Amino acid sequence: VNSFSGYLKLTDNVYIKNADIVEEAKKVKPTVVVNAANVYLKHGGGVAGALNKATNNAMQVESDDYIATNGPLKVGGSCVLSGHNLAKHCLHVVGPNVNKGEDIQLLKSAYENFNQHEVLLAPLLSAGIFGADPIHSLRVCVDTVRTNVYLAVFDKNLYDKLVSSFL
Numbered sequence: 001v002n003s004f005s006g007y008l009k010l011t012d013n014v015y016i017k018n019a020d021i022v023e024e025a026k027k028v029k030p031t032v033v034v035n036a037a038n039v040y041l042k043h044g045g046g047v048a049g050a051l052n053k054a055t056n057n058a059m060q061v062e063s064d065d066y067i068a069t070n071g072p073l074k075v076g077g078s079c080v081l082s083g084h085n086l087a088k089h090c091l092h093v094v095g096p097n098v099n100k101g102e103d104i105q106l107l108k109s110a111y112e113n114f115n116q117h118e119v120l121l122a123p124l125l126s127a128g129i130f131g132a133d134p135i136h137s138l139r140v141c142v143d144t145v146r147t148n149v150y151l152a153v154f155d156k157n158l159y160d161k162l163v164s165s166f167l
């Protein structure tokens, strides 16, 4: 038994809910929240700017130190940093940004990062301002992640479409 509430079960290991991932993290304080990061860990918008805003910019301060030491992530890659006031840990995962010409095939590599963690609160990778088809992202998630993933879908209209179209 874990602390997640109100999720629809899609598979053995994948759960989904119409929820603001930033709001959900504040309530649940999960072990791992996933950020929709870019390779620079520049948390301007979407999930990263809202999680970063919810940390009062502490996520960005930590991320800048990480990049100064390590250089940029790979598209499809990840790093584990603090979860600040939202979670124990934040797994920053870089899905391909379709609006920058990145190979959508890297979405599977991105979701493979989730398998290093037993339970995660996550958004749909490469969805929103990263420009991918969220229906595709949910299919790759289901077909790639084997650990227990709690998906928060901010858009109520999209949530309903994801559920009603799910195979």
Ligand SMILES: CSc1ccc(O)c(C(=O)O)c1
Binding pocket: 019, 020, 021, 022, 046, 047, 050, 123, 124, 127, 128, 129, 152, 153, 154, 155
């Ligand atoms: C504030 S939560 C958030 C923001 C932007 C997004 O695209 C998503 C989402 O895609 O689930 C969620």
